[PDB]
Amino acid sequence: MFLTRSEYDRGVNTFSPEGRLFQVEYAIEAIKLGSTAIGIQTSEGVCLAVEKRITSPLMEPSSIEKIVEIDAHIGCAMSGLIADAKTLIDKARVETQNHWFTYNETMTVESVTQAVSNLALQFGEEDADPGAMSRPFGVALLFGGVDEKGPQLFHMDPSGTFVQCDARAIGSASEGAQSSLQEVYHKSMTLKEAIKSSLIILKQVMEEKLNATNIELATVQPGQNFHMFTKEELEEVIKDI
Template sequence: MLPGCGLTKEPKAKGDFFEDSRVRRPRKGNCILKMFLTRSEYDRGVNTFSPEGRLFQVEYAIEAIKLGSTAIGICTQEGVVMAVEKRITSPLMEPTKVEKIVEVDRHIGCATSGLMADSRTLLDRARVECQNHWFVYNERMTVESCAQAVSSLAIQFGDSDDTGSAMSRPFGVAILFAGIENGEPQLWHMDPSGTYIRYDAKAIGSGSEGAQQNLQEYYLQTMTIKEAINLALSTLKQVMEEKLNSTNVEVMTMTAGELFRMFSKEEVEEYINNMS
């Protein structure tokens, strides 16, 4: 007699379930296979939620950013500082052509991490939106509105337009927006899910976890632009695999007076030498 089931012997298995009608337990191996196939279906769909409420393709895009170069943005009362790692994978590469920080408008600059081809598409949209806003309203677009316009494109994966074309996957890139709005410095972050949030200091890319912890420990709202540059460079120095030098890093400041300003190689080298 088997305990709890009223049977004198174990029923024989038949198909997916046991033969006796009083015991309807699925076979273990078949159950695992069905669970795997079910997850695989949600895994392929770019706009289909899993039963747990997750979009796996968006999560994969966020993970892709963690393979990119590290970028740091710091907002102070004087302005915004952005410092980005440049990965020079070959001595035959021209370092000046590896652009990680770009000017979207006079008052908005962006730093990216992730797939560079995807970043060009989103940054082109940001430039077009800023110029259209200036042409129509005769005023500069706000930093938040620029981030919102880019996020509207980022969340269109899986949608088709009038021509029938559709984006097959989310954009694998994260963007830091640095800008000046009515004399106030602002720093915004956008990820592949289309979420954009304002930050005082933010790190993205492969070294983002360690860099974010360092920023949380040493960031002060009262720090100056020079102190923010030193903090950004020292943080990059800790998380970068290569030795920090003026060739593999870009530095930009956004202030109410000068607006977008890229630092020259000599200026970056001077800051690095003063750190050591």
């Protein structure tokens, strides 16, 4: 056979040869430009750490809110295109509140990730103005939470798929982090043990050296709600290398 003309992705939602859509796997490793983020899901709770890769000293680090919480017991970690990532976040928040007042309890983490996945996938209605992107989201998401599961972790890829994963790493160095983490992971892990191992692997993976400003982490445990670590907490954690 001879190579000839072919329209490749003229239409969004064009199936590739061997049936494998374009924009979806274009965005999958458009992600790989994203910062490395680590999430560990142990019985004692979950931890969400991520590099902020400060480009220049002229920013104060406080601005880059790489980590937010969908709700008091649902913290979120993101990497890649922050732009529409915040719209993803805002939908997650409004959905959580919708469940909360309509149904007087805390919306469970699994349903949150499932609804967020529902938000994606709406690519091609170029004629229809309402409800559009015509572009897949280009951001990967990590959800931590506590409920009648307690500790939970969900990884989302820009394809509307997710898993009840635990100890799941995403970013530019995602594969190296995942490989090292596999051999590092322990089935029964204490809380700072996850903090410690995850921080060591972060120090090991990222380009720049590691300090308080370089990264941040947050945790939720069955004890109480979302906590975002402050500076002095980061020094008193990284004291021990």
